[PDB]
Amino acid sequence: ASQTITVGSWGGPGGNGWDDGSYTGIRQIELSYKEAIGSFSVIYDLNGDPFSGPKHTSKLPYKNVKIELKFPDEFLESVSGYTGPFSALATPTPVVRSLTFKTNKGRTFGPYGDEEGTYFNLPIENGLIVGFKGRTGDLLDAIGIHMSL
Amino acid sequence: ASQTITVGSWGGPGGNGWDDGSYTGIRQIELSYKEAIGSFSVIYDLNGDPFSGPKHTSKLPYKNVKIELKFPDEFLESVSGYTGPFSALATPTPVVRSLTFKTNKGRTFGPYGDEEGTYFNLPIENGLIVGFKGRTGDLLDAIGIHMSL
Amino acid sequence: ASQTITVGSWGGPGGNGWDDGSYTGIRQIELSYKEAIGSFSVIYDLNGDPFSGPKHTSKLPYKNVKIELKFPDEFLESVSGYTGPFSALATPTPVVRSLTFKTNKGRTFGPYGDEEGTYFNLPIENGLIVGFKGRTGDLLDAIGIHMSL
Amino acid sequence: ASQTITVGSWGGPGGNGWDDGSYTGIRQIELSYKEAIGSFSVIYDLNGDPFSGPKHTSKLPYKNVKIELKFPDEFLESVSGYTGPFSALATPTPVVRSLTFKTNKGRTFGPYGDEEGTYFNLPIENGLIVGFKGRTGDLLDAIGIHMSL
Ligand SMILES: OC[C@H]1O[C@H](O[C@@H]2[C@H](O)[C@@H](OC[C@H]3O[C@H](O)[C@@H](O)[C@@H](O[C@H]4O[C@H](CO)[C@@H](O)[C@H](O)[C@@H]4O)[C@@H]3O)O[C@H](CO)[C@H]2O)[C@@H](O)[C@@H](O)[C@@H]1O
Numbered sequence A, B, C, D: 001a002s003q004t005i006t007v008g009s010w011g012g013p014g015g016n017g018w019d020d021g022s023y024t025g026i027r028q029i030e031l032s033y034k035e036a037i038g039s040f041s042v043i044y045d046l047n048g049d050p051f052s053g054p055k056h057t058s059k060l061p062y063k064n065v066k067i068e069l070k071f072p073d074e075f076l077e078s079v080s081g082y083t084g085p086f087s088a089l090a091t092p093t094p095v096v097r098s099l100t101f102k103t104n105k106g107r108t109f110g111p112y113g114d115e116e117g118t119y120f121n122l123p124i125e126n127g128l129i130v131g132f133k134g135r136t137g138d139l140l141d142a143i144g145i146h147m148s149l
């Protein structure tokens, strides 16, 4: 067991809990969205070489986006997004409606989905997100992160 | 020069800047609140013994509070709070209007201040807050935190 | 880039430098030996599941040994071994003549090879070795480790 | 209660135990040596400012030394030293007979004491010493260290 500082758990209490674990760095991020984030997958770096992380896909006919990071010079500086219930869902729980990834080279990805509901921001001054935790039912219910130096 | 994962900078870019540093843990948090957050000091733990952190006191006549944590068994599990502009102030920049400290033993401190503006939540899953960064002018502009395992 | 505390670099200045990188934990260790450690490979744990690490095999007709750890309850508590030049080598540089892995459940592996030359001991009171660094020419020239909590 | 990777316990099980703790860095190390190591104090850095660490002084009449590190640019890169029994002592347990501090700027302190017994080397590749654990009776029995990034 190493263990990373894990802050997070942003969004719904529903869906199905999952945890990618901690790696070496973020190399790329995939995720479908529409009026909210559906699928979400990530490609971590593990000691200089790419490592395909576990998939958290969503049947929803959402929009796919590959976020290619200029790793390792570039890495996330902050993660933001919105959470809230969904018109289109049977369940009245909340979910990741939006998601915005900002990098240290001033690049910005998204916002994806809808910027509706309670906002959440994780400004990182020192350290790197090295892991993603979350819950996905029919779509990204919630999400959190792992960090190290 | 040891460093620590430092997430943060919730609040405005105004006031004068500061950073308490990284310690062993949090033993107690003192602060003054009214329609916003002013004074904010804290007593960190330094290898078992109490270390009085630098002062960040606001002239304003707010109501004071002592947050005595049942260290080392208890320690913050979360930090909520609000930020945004504010009347009664010549400056238009945003500041901490309210704070909320949840702890691992299920005890809740606050909300302190007016819950006005944009909410922010730092939910710690695994890890400890060990320091406070921030900005204070006439009162508490912003706030950030140092973390470690 | 995460990065782990890396202490080490025990043994010869020769051979060919290599680095396994940092993982999640030690799950098993393979290595050939005779009058010194020849081959050395390791199976790390990466978020609950086994991950075959890079191979550092040696042509030498040495003795093979698989060190199966009762992971995750069990993990190395200390690493010791000897370094020194080798009768059987052309080069007059030093190498990992011996190697002794001790676990937290009081189990002991080895010593492997020869307990000759300058001894080296890494007693760990808090933390886990999560990575191996080293140099291997015709046999394990040197070795070090990565650590986290 | 923050913790730190703590490797160590080089020396004997005798004398009375101690542990300075984890700080921000090492600024200066004081100590007394003759045919062995006696007194051993240290001034750690605490977020930019000097923090005088607890005293571990030995009655014996040894020669004293101030190890003034050119912090924060300079910090130890290695710790060598010897341990083993010792004459002039009723107790048969082992103790630190000598110490050697190498630094990142290529400066070397010591060897201090008699180089008698079993050598030990803590070569830091990546990381910082931030604390000292150990045991001291009439003089310095053993020594260990806290580390962090
Ligand atoms: O709200 C009424 C009713 O809801 C639950 O019963 C369900 C419901 O009848 C129906 O749900 C079908 C799916 O409808 C939408 O696609 C989603 O709400 C989906 O929920 C999943 O995804 C979201 C987001 O990822 C997540 O928050 C959820 O936890 C799920 O992972 C629904 O599954 O049909 C199913 C058939 O089994 C019913 O279970 C119950 O809560 C019920 O008590 C309630 O009255």
Ligand SMILES: OC[C@H]1O[C@H](O[C@@H]2[C@H](O)[C@@H](OC[C@H]3O[C@H](O)[C@@H](O)[C@@H](O[C@H]4O[C@H](CO)[C@@H](O)[C@H](O)[C@@H]4O)[C@@H]3O)O[C@H](CO)[C@H]2O)[C@@H](O)[C@@H](O)[C@@H]1O
Pocket: C012, C014, C015, C016, C088, C089, C090, C091, C092, C093, C095, C136, C137, C138, C139, C140, C141
């Ligand atoms: O010492 C005399 C001579 O040595 C070097 O020349 C070599 C030498 O003539 C011969 O070496 C063959 C191999 O012999 C043994 O198997 C080993 O010493 C091996 O060395 C490798 O493994 C060890 C341990 O893993 C490691 O320390 C070494 O760095 C190597 O990885 C030898 O390779 O033939 C080769 C043919 O290329 C010669 O290079 C030179 O140092 C020479 O200056 C010296 O006079």
Ligand SMILES: OC[C@H]1O[C@H](OC[C@H]2O[C@H](O)[C@@H](O)[C@@H](O[C@H]3O[C@H](CO)[C@@H](O)[C@H](O)[C@@H]3O)[C@@H]2O)[C@@H](O)[C@@H](O)[C@@H]1O
Pocket: B014, B015, B016, B088, B089, B090, B091, B092, B093, B095, B136, B137, B138, B139, B140, B141
């Ligand atoms: O003389 C300079 C300044 O004086 C008068 O503004 C005065 C104070 O008015 C309010 O109380 C605040 O705006 C305060 O601002 C301080 O605190 C803020 C939060 O703590 C911070 O954002 C500010 O940077 C500052 O530290 C003012 O000090 C007024 O006449 C101004 O026009 C004039 O510039």
Ligand SMILES: OC[C@H]1O[C@H](OC[C@H]2O[C@H](O)[C@@H](O)[C@@H](O[C@H]3O[C@H](CO)[C@@H](O)[C@H](O)[C@@H]3O)[C@@H]2O)[C@@H](O)[C@@H](O)[C@@H]1O
Pocket: D014, D015, D016, D088, D089, D090, D091, D092, D093, D095, D136, D137, D138, D139, D140, D141
């Ligand atoms: O009264 C107890 C003890 O007294 C006499 O031993 C005395 C001192 O002798 C030597 O100086 C040392 O052995 C010293 O031992 C202390 O320091 C050691 C290293 O610092 C440590 O290992 C020991 O645990 C102890 O702290 C002794 O104090 C002698 O008459 C003994 O027979 C008698 O037990």
